[PDB]
Symmetry: C3
Subunit: 116 residues, 3 copies
């Protein structure tokens, strides 16, 4: 049916429904760091959540990327993103400017993936 993982009153980090994995929005850990390091931390977090969900980063379907300042940080975010996935397995992607819930958060990813 529906499986939920890492749940509190506000959200589940992982929701799995009929083979599709929906992740809560993910942000980085170090609030003093630039967009490159925050993006690395986001991608590490996503990998951990995909492990728990029962899939892996070659089965990502669609990612929406929110940047606090797209003019400042698009290129730095891309420099990390473009190295993340094996060639041939990149998902659909969309990248837009939207402030996150704290001013030090420079990047947030919303991920949809697939179970094997």
């Amino acid at each position: 049916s529906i499986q939920r993982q890492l749940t509190n009153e506000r959200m589940s980090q992982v929701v799995v429904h009929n083979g599709t994995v929906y992740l809560a929005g993910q942000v980085g850990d170090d609030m003093t760091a630039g967009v490159e390091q925050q993006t690395r931390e986001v991608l590490n977090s996503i990998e951990r959540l995909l492990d728990l969900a029962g899939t892996d980063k070659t089965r990502i379907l669609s990612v929406t990327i929110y940047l606090k300042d797209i003019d400042a940080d698009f290129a730095g975010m891309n420099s990390v993103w473009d190295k993340w996935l094996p060639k041939g397995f990149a998902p659909a992607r969309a990248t837009v400017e939207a402030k996150l819930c704290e001013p030090q958060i420079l990047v947030e990813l919303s991920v949809i993936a697939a179970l094997p």
Copy 2:
């Protein structure tokens, strides 16, 4: 196949495909009210649409929340959101700042849910 409900030339409020429910973006009713009351009105609207789609608020998979001013209204929106769903059934969630189509609209939700 695909079922559509509450359809005009621009959008359907409800689209159901192979067990997944996609709702049009939902906003509140009272444009003079604060983010808490607008969020309550949004959640009521979502519940009505889920009723029509054939599911309920314990089967929500992923919600993206847009706030006109995330610094001003994140906490007020959360105060309503956090009370909405039974413990254990919260969906994936992402919350970002994006202006809605009228300046008095403080919050808009995009919902993906599942049929039983």
Copy 3:
């Protein structure tokens, strides 16, 4: 399983999983043009991608529309959008203000569709 089309290191334009089509974010071609012409170009691009994915514009499930300036361009975007699809087949829709990766880009669409 998962089919990917028009793939580079950063993204696939088309990802198909278990009957659901996820498109990469689409923008227009003419950066000097207004939101109406850019929206037309976006919709043409979407139609080409849906052709490749094996579906068509009457099987769109959900679209999120990002506008650089929602106050300026909501109405112009709508004037094109509202004419696009046969009556009765409109998807779920959400429209918000989010800057795209270049200042001349006025509109970007993220599309989820269904295979027949």
